[PDB]
Every structure is written in structure tokens, then in C-alpha cells.
Ligand binder design. Sequence first.
Ligand SMILES: *[C@@H]1O[C@H](CO)[C@@H](O[C@@H]2O[C@H](CO)[C@@H](O)[C@H](O)[C@H]2NC(C)=O)[C@H](O)[C@H]1NC(C)=O
Ligand SMILES: *[C@@H]1O[C@H](CO)[C@@H](O[C@@H]2O[C@H](CO)[C@@H](O)[C@H](O)[C@H]2NC(C)=O)[C@H](O)[C@H]1NC(C)=O
Ligand SMILES: *[C@@H]1O[C@H](CO)[C@@H](O[C@@H]2O[C@H](CO)[C@@H](O)[C@H](O)[C@H]2NC(C)=O)[C@H](O)[C@H]1NC(C)=O
Ligand SMILES: *[C@@H]1O[C@H](CO)[C@@H](O[C@@H]2O[C@H](CO)[C@@H](O)[C@H](O)[C@H]2NC(C)=O)[C@H](O)[C@H]1NC(C)=O
Ligand SMILES: *[C@@H]1O[C@H](CO)[C@@H](O[C@@H]2O[C@H](CO)[C@@H](O)[C@H](O)[C@H]2NC(C)=O)[C@H](O)[C@H]1NC(C)=O
Ligand SMILES: CCCCCCCC
Ligand SMILES: CCCCCCCC
Ligand SMILES: CCCCCCCC
Ligand SMILES: CCCCCCCC
Ligand SMILES: CCCCCCCC
Lengths: 346, 346, 346, 346, 346
Amino acid sequence: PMPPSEFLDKLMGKVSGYDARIRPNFKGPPVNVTCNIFINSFGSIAETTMDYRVNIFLRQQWNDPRLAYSEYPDDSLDLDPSMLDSIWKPDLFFANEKGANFHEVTTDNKLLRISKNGNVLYSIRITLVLACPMDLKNFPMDVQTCIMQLESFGYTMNDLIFEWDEKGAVQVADGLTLPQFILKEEKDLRYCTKHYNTGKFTCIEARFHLERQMGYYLIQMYIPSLLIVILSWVSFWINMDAAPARVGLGITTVLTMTTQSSGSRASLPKVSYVKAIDIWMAVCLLFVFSALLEYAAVNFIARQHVEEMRKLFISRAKRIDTVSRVAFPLVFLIFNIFYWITYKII
Amino acid sequence: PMPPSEFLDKLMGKVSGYDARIRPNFKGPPVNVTCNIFINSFGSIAETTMDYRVNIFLRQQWNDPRLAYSEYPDDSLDLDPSMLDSIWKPDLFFANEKGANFHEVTTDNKLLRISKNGNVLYSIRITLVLACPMDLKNFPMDVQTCIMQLESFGYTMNDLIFEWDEKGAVQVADGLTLPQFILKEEKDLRYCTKHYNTGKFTCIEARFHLERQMGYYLIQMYIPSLLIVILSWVSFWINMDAAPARVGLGITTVLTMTTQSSGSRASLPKVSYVKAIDIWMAVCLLFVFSALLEYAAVNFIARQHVEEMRKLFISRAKRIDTVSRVAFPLVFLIFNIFYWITYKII
Amino acid sequence: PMPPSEFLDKLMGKVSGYDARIRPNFKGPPVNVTCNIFINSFGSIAETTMDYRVNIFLRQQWNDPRLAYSEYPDDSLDLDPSMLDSIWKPDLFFANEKGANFHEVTTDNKLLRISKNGNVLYSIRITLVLACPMDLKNFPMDVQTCIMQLESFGYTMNDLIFEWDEKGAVQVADGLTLPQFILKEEKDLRYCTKHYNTGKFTCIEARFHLERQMGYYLIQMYIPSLLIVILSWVSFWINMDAAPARVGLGITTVLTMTTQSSGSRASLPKVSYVKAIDIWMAVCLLFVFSALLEYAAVNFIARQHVEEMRKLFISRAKRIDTVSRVAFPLVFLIFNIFYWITYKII
Amino acid sequence: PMPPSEFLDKLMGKVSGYDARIRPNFKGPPVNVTCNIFINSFGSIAETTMDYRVNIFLRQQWNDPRLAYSEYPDDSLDLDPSMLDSIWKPDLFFANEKGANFHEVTTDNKLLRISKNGNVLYSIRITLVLACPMDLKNFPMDVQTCIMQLESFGYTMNDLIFEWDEKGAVQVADGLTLPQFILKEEKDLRYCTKHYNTGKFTCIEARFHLERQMGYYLIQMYIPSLLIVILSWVSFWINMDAAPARVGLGITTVLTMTTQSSGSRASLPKVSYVKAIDIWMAVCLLFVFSALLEYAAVNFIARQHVEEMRKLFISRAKRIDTVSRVAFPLVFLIFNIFYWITYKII
Amino acid sequence: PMPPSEFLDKLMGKVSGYDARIRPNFKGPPVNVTCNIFINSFGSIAETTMDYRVNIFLRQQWNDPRLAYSEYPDDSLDLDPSMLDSIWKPDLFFANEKGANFHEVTTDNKLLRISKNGNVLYSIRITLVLACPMDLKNFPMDVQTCIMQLESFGYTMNDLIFEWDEKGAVQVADGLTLPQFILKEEKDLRYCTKHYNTGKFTCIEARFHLERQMGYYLIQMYIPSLLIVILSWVSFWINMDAAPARVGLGITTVLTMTTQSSGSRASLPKVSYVKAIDIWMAVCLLFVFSALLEYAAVNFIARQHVEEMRKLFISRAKRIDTVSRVAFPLVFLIFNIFYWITYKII
Ligand SMILES: *[C@@H]1O[C@H](CO)[C@@H](O[C@@H]2O[C@H](CO)[C@@H](O)[C@H](O)[C@H]2NC(C)=O)[C@H](O)[C@H]1NC(C)=O
Ligand SMILES: *[C@@H]1O[C@H](CO)[C@@H](O[C@@H]2O[C@H](CO)[C@@H](O)[C@H](O)[C@H]2NC(C)=O)[C@H](O)[C@H]1NC(C)=O
Ligand SMILES: *[C@@H]1O[C@H](CO)[C@@H](O[C@@H]2O[C@H](CO)[C@@H](O)[C@H](O)[C@H]2NC(C)=O)[C@H](O)[C@H]1NC(C)=O
Ligand SMILES: *[C@@H]1O[C@H](CO)[C@@H](O[C@@H]2O[C@H](CO)[C@@H](O)[C@H](O)[C@H]2NC(C)=O)[C@H](O)[C@H]1NC(C)=O
Ligand SMILES: *[C@@H]1O[C@H](CO)[C@@H](O[C@@H]2O[C@H](CO)[C@@H](O)[C@H](O)[C@H]2NC(C)=O)[C@H](O)[C@H]1NC(C)=O
Ligand SMILES: CCCCCCCC
Ligand SMILES: CCCCCCCC
Ligand SMILES: CCCCCCCC
Ligand SMILES: CCCCCCCC
Ligand SMILES: CCCCCCCC
């Protein structure tokens, strides 16, 4: 018979009363649009900007009873995407876009198919840079919940309603891994219905739980800060009379821990609250600073000068050294028990 | 009866004398447009560039008596945003744009509805990168007032007048927080009417008060600079004869305070006036530099060499050391009283 | 006779029943499109972003029996690229685009020619920023396999099938070299057929093997880390009584190896697993840290003080020094044998 | 009578012989266009790129005798900017664009009004990133003259002539300040007429004089380099026998002045000639390097060893120390007189 | 008579058989297009990216015998650039674009004029970011040859041929200087004809020779590395018994030369071969490392301890010091002769 685009001339055209500016079931019940996404790419989760770039296939399904047909024999029509300006489409957008674009290389990456009863499937490829507020109270040991939410800009709740479908509403690609995070399989799917002075609008959203990887922040921050604290402990095995040696060891370790602490936050937002790497780098700064304050007590007691009272202060300044060769590895060992268990419960 | 877009053919079309190039009430009183905004996103407040990126819903309300209707029964018409090139719209712009764009993903994020008497509501989503001049006289302790202003480019004051509405002229989203700032609830709403040689044009503006967060700049700048000053004070408890120890402690502390002071301004505009962190990092540099100048007096008096006069200079060089073990923590303590009270009054 | 664009009016126009929205051999066998690419530019292989920018000529060949001709004498028609919106073209895209664009300077860089039997050749110039996941288990000694894959967005497998051609399916330009990598001549060409809930779609892909260049990472990372380890070995030829000399040499070498190790990963993704440069910079950090722990044993044994037992500890602390002048260059020499052979097998 | 856009149908349309492709007074005298600009924003004056971003209102005034009217009563017509593709406009451009764009948010920011005799006023908002070659012979003490020039691309001198108007040809906004510079009120306005092999074209330009702010470069570069030179002078008040103290003070000050000198040019173009901060940082490097060479003479004379000749070399090595405690602050004081007066004359 | 745009209606229109999709002299000899460029801007020659941004006027001259006229009296027609979609233009592009754009501010910066015999002149303004592979075998002493090449995408050699003109085929603006380079006046102009499997296409190219400026890399890299080598030579004038002084001078100079060497390649591509600054920074690292190895021989010989044999080792360890006070400035002086003459021949 007729070819389907020329059959769509009798379906999209001005004959038979079709207008692409009017929603289906007009002056009636609202349009029920059900949605699911397919995540191709995910990542580049920046924390200075507090955003993440995603690449999705946005699928939408509604029903247009004006687009029903019965003369054509087959069940679906793979229409050309240049004829998408002639149908009605919902005005979905993202409440946290922060910039987005289509993909237009070699063809607009768009998809249209219409069933016999008017069921319209519409899939497009979108790249989003979605804004999620980070919560960094325990920074290497945190779980982030970055969301994406899908709203309607022009049609209110009594005209257009978004839903998720009950058969896998968020699909993820096969080889989709992350360098810093892991993506949990459970995904929250709930409503986020927005109220304004204009009206109430539909909104659906999807939460993504991101658990980090411990292994990077151990190698750069935890292990080298653990070596400078041990480097301060060899001052106690050096002679007391070696005054430029034990002081110059105390200076250099207490001023690299300032450098290691400032470099721990170079790729972070400038948040005011204190985090788990900050209370590691402040207590590890306290051990290397109280080791140089130990020798200031050793150097002050030993100068107190009868040689019978002189033997008291030398044996006292050696008594304060034999205690600290055991006590400072012992207090730092029971700090590691209190630190890592607190951030393994959470 | 007729569908409303085809009813808008009898309302927007060339019949009944409607032209989308002519303002309403032409050859009459000026067009009164009232406006309010809704702030979705706010932040990325850069200081090197002195700007901030915002994401608003710009709502505009005017009256077009040509767009009145009485045959259609309902009170409003949710028209399609593709028919916005057929109505008259005001030429609002921003006097401090520095680049801006629309949002066009899956639909142009636009909104149109027309009342029965011709009241037109027009809402669009805009992303702005607005320029605000920073005032950094007291940099961690300042309050910034970054503005946005809304002008008319083509129509003068006798043709088009902007207003704010008297019912919440600036709304803010619910979970809108900032990493570095807090946004005060009181918002100034005043006029900024511009005069040129072309004419006088309407202008309305809105001030936003931004108070910082103290907790970031304490952890990175105030507390580590406070430790290097205390690190200079342990030189006084070291033996006077330890010449490479007390000098090498004075060198290393006075040359990391140069490093800490240059890093205090790495993310700042290159302003010439002196600020509150600069007079902290210069006085804290004065304590660590006058502690090494103290030992240059200790090392010079002790070399002055009868052994009866030799006992005078050693007891004098110990007299200058017992004073400075009390005096230098005392002067720095009464500087912290004068510093933090001065920047708590302001 | 007629000029070929006006002959294409009788070939592309609405006469003779040609529609540019309908695939060839409609209601029949699927469209067989064969493809080959020509790589002009290649490089800027970023590892923080894990992507690479390429510049290709994408050639596509199919058959449209509607575009056959017999009146015109010649075998091909170099048509103008402005008449490409009037023919049918396949909807090829890239599953790992991450942004791409056309080249439109002085003309849309496009090419069309049609044979007598309807064979259509279509070449365009595309710039792609293709995403490839890096595998950095042995980072200076790795081979990366970065792919590119070519899919169909709208037409399923029963409507459109992609192939490679059997005569050089990937060509490379003549003077195409890379600063960091070399491109192997063998290129894998296989299928990547994607299944969704929408349908199954065609996919072809091409693997590119990238072997690095050793010579950069030797000069910056391996050789300067090899000098600091040798710099720690001159402590054993310094007098034992020079306590600020041998300690201050141990401090400075063990705290620059922390700086050299953190700078080894400044241009890398924040991956958690350990790599070959990390186990070089951790063992080279172990030699410079166990050289300062050697002198802490030398300084502790020599202080143990009858002068007959005093001569035992001095000769014992010299015995531990004569061993380490041979043993520490010997263990580091047999570590270089185990390190470089392990990463020459792989 | 008729509304003015429909009156412009009888003025812009194909009736009465109006063509928007033909300049006014065709086959006659050239078109005299007079221009003035209004600078909204100014700044972001980069020196690595040697450019500056400006935001102007470009106003143009010419006369089109085809656009004269006498039936309409008023003196001017605020026409809609969508009807700007129907009039003739001059082809003004900028010879140092380096990228530029229009402003299109909520309306194309354009302005058109036509007088009764045909005088056409045309104002648009443009953002420019204008290229100006920096002259950095005396870098903190320089005055830069960054220009902007306005040419014609298609029409030669015998068809179109640009002028400035004699009533304020460059206006500046009220609160327009700069963080690093000040903008002088005197602005040069002269001709820059370009000759090619195509023809001679009109050109007008406007010079802007930019004087810097001294106060930033004192705080970061001049004052901390002045402290390290004073820090070298305390070596002369330390005992001569303190060999690791006076040498280790000479090493650390001469190797931070290398760091301070390299950081003085991190935000600069890589120019080959020597500038005023380079001859400050090289002479201040000469004082801290000749202070360590002073102790190498003190340490060499004092080792020359009858004890009667031994008392000669110790008193000679103390004679060379008492001179340098006065001479080195004296030579550096008379260098500051010669340095700052030379760069206050210029 | 008729105005020339309306005369161009009888010249460009569908009357008299003109089609803008067909090349001139069709079914005949190929179209000879001659070209010349005018370089407005040049620079921003990045080396990490290995590209350079240029701003040219691209002029093209061909002959269209369909566009000849004899009724109109004058010799040329300055046509409006909006009528450029109605003529035939060659499909010139650049084989190393890496992104490019037009300039569209206030008018498309385009130019068209047609002689009486049909000679068409066509000039446009283009900004290019052209890719040139750097050759950095002798990096501060190199001459770079960065090219640009102009090809045809659709028309082969038998349809369209590019040429340069014999009267100044590349012009350069007057005040066009570079911060890092100088541009030689001799410019190579040759052919680059490309062969594919599609066909053979025309190509012309132009080489630009860029000689650097020595004066920047002396101030930052050569002179400060020359001071650290001299700084190592003052160790020989310090007492042998000053063990923390001569060792601590050897440590600090040998670990800043690692810092100076890594900073010599921070703005470079990661190339594997060795360059002229690398063999400067490796030999200058060899002098500062063999000066600390000198004192390890001084400190080891002097410890060898009858006092008659004790006077032998002290006089031997002073003999090895008097040689090196002459020998090390002598070997470094004859290295500067061999280094700078080798890179003055090339
Ligand atoms: C869209 O979905 C909703 C819920 O399925 C429908 O709203 C209800 O429809 C039933 C029967 O159609 C009515 O009995 C109810 O009064 C409706 N409201 C509620 C709250 O249950 C709606 O009809 C659907 N619209 C379309 C076009 O299918
Ligand atoms: C726009 O608002 C202004 C102020 O409300 C109106 O201007 C006044 O209107 C009243 C009566 O309409 C007059 O008595 C005054 O002379 C006007 N001017 C002033 C300064 O008060 C104006 O009419 C409104 N325009 C429209 C179309 O509603
Ligand atoms: C596209 O290529 C395939 C394989 O060459 C063709 O599919 C086969 O065609 C032959 C004969 O034409 C049939 O016997 C087979 O049943 C087909 N399928 C398979 C799996 O072999 C297909 O015909 C080609 N389509 C076009 C338009 O040429
Ligand atoms: C544009 O301005 C110039 C200078 O004002 C005009 O050129 C002169 O016009 C006068 C009289 O009109 C003549 O006597 C001269 O011969 C012209 N040339 C010079 C060098 O003085 C020109 O006429 C003006 N063009 C228009 C359309 O007004
Ligand atoms: C373009 O230039 C070439 C060379 O000038 C022309 O090709 C030659 O033209 C002459 C006479 O026209 C013939 O004798 C030759 O056979 C041609 N080929 C060669 C290799 O010399 C060509 O005619 C020119 N085309 C146009 C339209 O002018
Ligand atoms: C949440 C405050 C922690 C304070 C820790 C005190 C020891 C550094
Ligand atoms: C506003 C000038 C402050 C100067 C402080 C002086 C002590 C550093
Ligand atoms: C794969 C783990 C390697 C651990 C090496 C242990 C010595 C540093
Ligand atoms: C213009 C050359 C200045 C050279 C100064 C010499 C002393 C550093
Ligand atoms: C081209 C190899 C040069 C090697 C120089 C050896 C001395 C550093």
C-alpha cells in the first residue's frame, strides 16, 4: 500500500485534525508518561565543583490516541527522527542540569516508534553534568548519594504525570566501572513533586549510592603521614648531647606534616566543618610536635648545674627518655585502634 | 468548540490585527512588567574572576489587551512554547551577564499562559555568570553583597517599566546551601535606573548578602601559622651553646612563614590594599623573625671576653633569655586579644 | 543533456517516488553498510580523564536501488554536499562519544558519490573524544587497548547491519607519530552487538594497541629516585661522631622520597590498586629509611659505657658499619634484577 | 493611521524600491558612519595570553535617504530588532577579535531607531577578548596602552568611512574599577587606515592607558625578598667558630632567593629581555650569595696556623667581620636609592 | 539602469541557467583556484598540545564564465555576503584543523567581488588552531617548522586544482611579533598532494620557520643551575673538621638540582628522547654530586689512625682538597666550551 512516512502524512498532517501543540486526552485525564534510563557512561565526579557527568538514554512512553492506525498491517513504525517536530512530546527537563547537550553526530541520536493503539516510544541520548551536594564529614570513609531528578516545566500535575516503569527503571551498562567509586546495585526510585507559585509540577528522581575506594588515600595520605610519625621516634635513640641532631629532626618532621596536611585538602571544596582526614592529620601533627617538646624538656633538665646533684639531673633526663621510647609507640598504637574502629562502624 | 492552539490562530494570526512587533497600549501609557525570580542553584563564587554562577526561573507578568478572549470558557491557556515567536515579549537583559545561556534539553524550558483579560505569564530558565566586585578589606571576616540587575535594551522609560511584585519577589529553593558562604534571608530590592545618551531605561536589582564560614580558613591558615610561632618559642629552652640548633630553628621557621604567607593569597585577586589575613601573616612573621634576632643578641653578648667580667656577660645573656620565655608568649597573647576583637566588632 | 544536479532533480525529487525517510529495500532484507576509517590525527591521550582525541574520515558504503540511473553516461556523480538532506543516510553513532563535532570551515567537509547501480559512497570528517578505560597495573610498562565502536541508534538488526570492508578497514596517515606512545600495525576488528529492551542493534568496533615509551619515565622518576638511594649510602663513609651530619643526611633523603613519590602520581587517575611505579617508590623509600635506622643502631651501641668493655662497643659499632657499606649496594642490586626482569617478561 | 511596523512594510518592503543589499547613496559619495562605545565591563587582563575581555555597547549612526518618511507624525521609530535583517548595516569588525560573541538572552540585545530624515541609530551589545601586546621592560612600574580598532571588511574607503563623534566618543560606566590597574580618563582617538592588495579600508581606533597598582607586588615580591637579605646579615653577629650555623644560614637564604625569583615570573609571558623585577631579584640574589662568600673568607683566614702569627689571622678574620656589619647594610641602602629613583622618573 | 543586486538576480537566479551546485567549466578542464593568505595574528604556540593558533584572511580566486557580464558598465561588483549561498565556492579545508571557526560579529566577515570576465575574488576571516609536531632534540636551541596545508575534500585533481599566486602568496601584518619566537621572512611554498582510496586530491602548503629566543631560558634555567654548581665549590674552602657544614652543603645543593631539573620539563610534552637542556641538567647534577663524594673521601682518609703516620693522612686529605679547588672550576669551564660550541654550530 502506502509507504509508512507517506502513511504518516495521513497521520501527522493537517488532515484528520492532528495538532502537535495539544496534549493527548485534552480536556480530560492527565497524560501518563512512564520513563526509564540506560546509563552508558558515569564518572568524572568532581568535588571542587560538586558535580558528575553522566551519559544516558532517556526513554519515554505515553499514549496518543490520535496516532492510532488500523489500515497498516504491522505493529510498529520506525519513523525517521526528522519527523519529531510534528508530534507531541513531553517537556521533561532536569532540575540540576548545570549544562547539558544533545548528540548530533552523523544523525540526531533520536528514536521514535508508534504502536497500533498509539503507544509512543521515544528515546534520546543526553549528556548531563548533574549537581549533587557532597557530604564530607568522614571523607575517605564516606558514602555519597548523588541524585538526578526529572521534572515538567510547562504542564502541571493535572495535565502531565511522570512515572517510572516497574520493569528495571534504571539500567546500567556492562563494563561500567569507576576509578574512585563503586556503584551499588540498589537504586532508590521515589517522587520529588515540586510546588511553586505557578503550580504543582510532576517530578521523579533516582538516587545513586557511591562508596569510595580506600586504597588510593592510604598510599598518598595515611601511609606517608604514618612514616613521619615513626621518623620522629628515632630522636629518642640519638644521644642527648647531639643538640643540632635531635632538634633538627624535630623541626623537619613538624614542618613536613604541615605540608602533608595542606596537600590533603588541595582537591576539596572549602568546607568549614572538620572531617576524618583532618582529625588524622591533626593528631599525627600532635605526635611530631610533642616529640620536639620532649627534647626541650630533656635539654632543660640536663643543664641544671656539687657533682652529686649533677648526677641526679642527668639520670632524670635519661629517665624521661626511657619512658618515651615505649610510651609514644604505645599511645599512637591505641589511637589507631580508636580511629579505625570508629570509621569502620560508620 | 475549537482547540486552543487553533483558537490561538484567531488570536495570534494576522486576522483581528495582531502584530508581534508592537508593544501593548501603543501610543499610550508604558507597559508595566512585574517580575520575580526563583533561585534553583547558586554558588561557584570565584574570587579570581570575581563572579558567581546562578540558575534562575525568570518570571514576567504584563498585560496585552489584544490577547483577551471571551468565547473560550476556561480562565487560562497553557500554550506551547513554540508559539512564543508570535507574541510580544519584553527585552529584558542583565547588565552584568558575562555570558549566559538558555536551557534547551528535550524542550526549550519555557512557559506561557494567558488569562481572560490578557494577563500574560512568561517563565524561562536561565543560567547566568554574574559579575560582582569583591571587597576584601577583611578577607576571612567579610560580608559580600553580590547583586543582579535587570534592564531594558530597546524600550525607554516612557514605553516599558520593570517592577518587582509585592508577594515574595525573590524565592529560594529549599535545600540550597553553599560550601563557603551562607545566604541571608533579607534581600534588598531597589531601582537602578540607567541614563545614557540614547535615553533613560528601566532597571530593577536585587542584592544578596553573603557571610562566609570561618572554619575553613582557621584550619588551613590561622592554626598552622599559630604553630610555627609556638615552634619558634622552643628556641629559648635550648642551650645557648647549641649554635647550629637555635639558629637552624630560627631559619626554618622564618622561611616557612614566607611560604605560608604566599600561599594565603594564591586563590585571590591581585589587589593592592592590605587585608586582615595579610596583617595576621605579617605580624606572625614578625614574631618568628624577632626570635632569631633574639639569639643574635644572645650569641653576641656571650662572646664578650679577667673571668670576673666574663661571668657578667654570661649572666646577662641568661637574663635576656629568662625574660623572653615569658615576654614573647605574653605579647602574642595580647595581640590575639586586639586582633580578634577588632574583627568581631566589624 | 541535463546537468547532473538537475538530473538529480529527477532522481531526488518527489517525482518517481523517492522519499528520504525510508530505508532502501524496505519490507525486505536489511541494509548492508560497509565502513572504513582514515585516521588523520591521534593523540592527546589523557589519563586523568581516561580519554583520547582522534580525527577520522568516516566512509560509509551502501546500496540504494532507487538512486540507480541509466540515461546519464558517466559512472559516478560527485554531488554537492548541500543535497545530503535529500538522501537516506544511516544513523551511525559512537557508543563512547564524550562529545564530538563536525568540521564546517569554508564548506561542510562532506562527500557524496553515487554509482550507476546505486552504490552510495559517503565520507565525512569527525573529531571524537573517545573514552577508553585505562588499566594501570604496571604503569610505565603497560600496553593500552583503547577502542572505538560504531552503533545504530534507530534501526535494529533486521533493518540495518554494519560491517567492515575486507580491504584495509582502518587506514592511518603517513606521518602520524605520538609523543608518549607507539601505535601497533595490527588492529583488531570485531563485533560488539548490543542488546537492550528496545531491541538488538548492530555494532562494529576497532581496537588500537598503544605501547608506551620508557625514556620519559626513566629521566623524571627512575633515575632521580636512584640517586637519592645512592645519596643515602654516603652516610656510611662519614664519621660516627658526626651526629648532625649522618642524621641530617638521613632526614633529608627520607623526606624527598616522600616528595618524589607523591609527584609520581600527580598526572594519574585516583585508582586504588598498586602499580609498578608505586612498588618502585615504596622499596626505594625503604632503603633510605632503613639507612637512617642503621645509624640509630650505630649511635645507640656506641654510647654503651671499664674501658675494656668500652672498646667492645666501639668495635661493634664499626663492625655494623663495615657490613652495611657492602650489604646495602648488594641488596639494592639484586632488587633491580628482580624488578626489571619481572616487568620485561610482561 | 497605520501602525509603524506595518508602516515599515511600506518602508522596508519590495515596494518603493528598497533593497537591503545596497548601500545608501549608491554610485555616489561614501557612507559616513560615526561611532561611539560604552564600556560596561573591563578587566580580566591576562598577561600569559596578552589579552583583555571587554563588554561594550557599539553604537553606529549613518543616513539612509531611502528610509525617510513624512506621513508618520513622530520623530523616531523604535523598531523591533527582528526586522534588522531587512535594513542595510555596515560591516564593522575588530582587527584583534580573538573570539567574540553577541548577547542573545531573552531578546537579541539590539536597538534600532530611525529619524524622519533617515538617520539610523543602531546599538548592540558585544563581548570582545581583545589582543594587546604587552611591553614589560619595567614590569611592576609600567603603563600599558591596550587598543581596540574597528575596521570594514567588504567596503573600501570610497564606499564606507568610519568616524568617531565629537561628543564623548568613548563613555565609561560609573562603578568601573579594576583590581590590578587604573584607567586614565584621557583616551586617544585616531585613525589606523589599512592597506592591502584588495584595497584600502577604513579603520578607527581607541587607546586605553592602564597604570598598575604597586601595592600587590610589594607584599608578595619586594618585601619578602627584602627580608631574606636582612636574614643573611645576622650571620655576621654569629660566632666564627659556629661553622654549621653560618654556612647553613648562607645555604638556606641563597636557595630560597632562587625560589622567590622563579616564582616572580610564573604568571608572565616567556619574554627574553630583562625587566625591573628581574634586576631586583638578581641583585638581591647577589647580596645573599656574597654573604656566604664572606664567611668562606672568614673560615679560610682563621685556619692559617708560632702563636704570635696565629693572633694575626684571628684579628684579621675579625677585622673582615666588623667591616661587613656596616658595609653590607650600607651598599644595599644606596642600591635602594638608585633602584627606586630610576623607576620613579620613568 | 538596474541596481547590481537586482542585476545579480539576472545573474545568480534560475534564469539563464545558473546552478550553484555545479563547478565552472563542467565536463571540461579542472577549476584552477589560486590562493594567498594574510596573517593578522600568530602565536600562543603551545608545546604540551603541540599546536598554534593563527588568524588569517583566506583569499581565493577562480573564474566562473557563467558570471560574466557586459551590460553593466563598471569592472567589479562588491556584492553582499548574504548572497554567497547562491554562487559556487571551492571546498577548501585544512588537513590539521584541530578546531576552527568563522568570525560573525556585526556581519559575517566575508568578501565577494566579480570582474567582467567572471574572475571571482573571495576573502574570509578564519581562526585556526593548527597542529604541528614539535622536534625538541635541542630544546632552547631549536628551529621549528610549523606548517599549514590546504586541501579539497570533495573534488579530485581532475576537477579542482589549488595553487599559490606568484605575487606574495603569504603576507604578514606589520606589528606581528612573538614573545618566545621570531618568524623568518623566507616561507616555503610547495605541494602536498594526497592519495587515498577515494582518489587523489589537491593540496598546497606553507612552511613557517620559528627560531626561539635564548634570553628567557638563560634567566630561569641556565643561570640558576650555574649558581648551584658554584655554590658546591665553596665546600672546599670550609674546614675539613666542619662535618655537618660540608655535608649539609652537599645535601642541599644535590637535592635542589633535582628540583631544578624536574621544573625544566613541566611545560613540555612527555617525549622519551634526551634533549639539550636534559644533558645540561644531568652534567650540572654530576658536578654537585661528585662534590659531596669528594668530602666522603676527605672524611674517610682523615680518620685513618703512631702520630707520624697520622700526619700522612691529614696531609693527604689536604692534598686532595688543594687539587679540587682548581680542578673542579677547570673541568666545568671546559665543559661550557664543549656545550655551547656544539649548540652554536647547529
Ligand atoms: C493516568 O493514571 C492515573 C492513575 O492510574 C489515572 O487516574 C485515575 O483513573 C481512574 C480510572 O481511569 C479514575 O477512577 C481515577 O479517578 C483517577 N484518579 C486517581 C487518583 O486514581 C488516569 O486516568 C490516567 N490518565 C490516562 C490518560 O490514562
Ligand atoms: C503603569 O503604572 C503607572 C503607575 O501605576 C501608571 O502611570 C500612572 O497611571 C495613572 C492612571 O492610570 C495616571 O493618573 C498617572 O498620570 C500615571 N503616572 C504616574 C507617575 O503616576 C501607568 O498608567 C501604568 N500603565 C499601564 C499600561 O497600566
Ligand atoms: C545483507 O547481507 C546478508 C549476508 O550477506 C544477506 O542475508 C542473507 O542473504 C541471502 C541471499 O540474499 C539469504 O540466502 C540469507 O537467508 C540471508 N541471511 C543469512 C544469515 O545468510 C542480506 O540479503 C543482505 N541484504 C541486502 C539488501 O543485500
Ligand atoms: C562624507 O564625509 C565627507 C567629508 O565630510 C564628504 O566628502 C566631501 O563632501 C564635500 C561636499 O559634500 C565635497 O566638496 C568633497 O569633495 C568631499 N571630499 C573631501 C575630501 O572633502 C562626503 O560627501 C560625505 N558623504 C555623505 C554621503 O555624506
Ligand atoms: C588549469 O591550469 C592547467 C595548467 O595551466 C591547464 O591544463 C593545461 O591546459 C593547456 C591548454 O589549456 C593544455 O594544453 C594542457 O593539456 C593542460 N594540461 C597540462 C598538464 O598542461 C588547464 O587548462 C587550466 N584549466 C582552466 C579551466 O583554465
Ligand atoms: C570533633 C572535634 C575533635 C577534636 C579532637 C581534639 C584532639 C585533636
Ligand atoms: C593598616 C596598616 C597596618 C600596619 C601594621 C604595622 C605592624 C605590622
Ligand atoms: C603486591 C603487594 C606488594 C607488596 C610489596 C611488599 C614490600 C614493599
Ligand atoms: C641591563 C643589564 C643590567 C645588568 C646589571 C648587572 C648587575 C646585576
Ligand atoms: C646522548 C647521550 C649523552 C650521554 C652523556 C653522558 C654523560 C652524562
